[PDB]
Design a protein around this nucleic acid. Structure first.
Length: 98
RNA sequence: AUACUUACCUGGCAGGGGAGAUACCAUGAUCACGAAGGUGGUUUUCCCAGGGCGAGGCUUAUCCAUUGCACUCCGGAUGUGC
């Protein structure tokens, strides 16, 4: 709930393959700012979710505001802030601890 | 039912993966203790020459469950071709 460099997106159609989904997520989410990375996994816990890491929290917040509910493969997108900083964020800040 | 002598009718020979290394067995080698090699084994490296074990791994659909906060690949089962 507290703004973050990374946004977390879930409730995605699970049929889409990892590389396809990363590609289309990059395409969809670049409109709001420079994206450093999009992390997707299809494991049991992680399937259906992606982390988009933006350079600025303001871009993250605006992407959340705009895309909240966006029709995506016949499903409304659910977006939250990441609970924790993404490793590449934490290393740029020097906050990272194993 | 068997063997013996004769006539007639049928029919192609050799074999059992191959090349190296064998200190050890057999051949108990015809000259005052002896062969080597070779031949037939046992041991030991390969072109892998065919098979058995299908663990592991690759490609893609079906079924069940998951709303999951990860950043060292990886949910369970069935089918097709390797």
């Amino acid at each position: 709930t507290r703004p973050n460099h990374t946004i977390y997106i879930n409730n995605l159609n699970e049929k889409i393959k990892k590389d396809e989904l990363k590609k289309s997520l990059y395409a969809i989410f670049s409109q709001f700012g420079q994206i450093l990375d999009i992390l997707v996994s299809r494991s049991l816990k992680m399937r259906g979710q992606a982390f988009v890491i933006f350079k600025e929290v303001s871009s993250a917040t605006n992407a959340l505001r705009s895309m909240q509910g966006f029709p995506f493969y016949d499903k409304p997108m659910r977006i939250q802030y990441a609970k924790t900083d993404s490793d590449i964020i934490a290393k740029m800040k020097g906050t990272f601890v194993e």
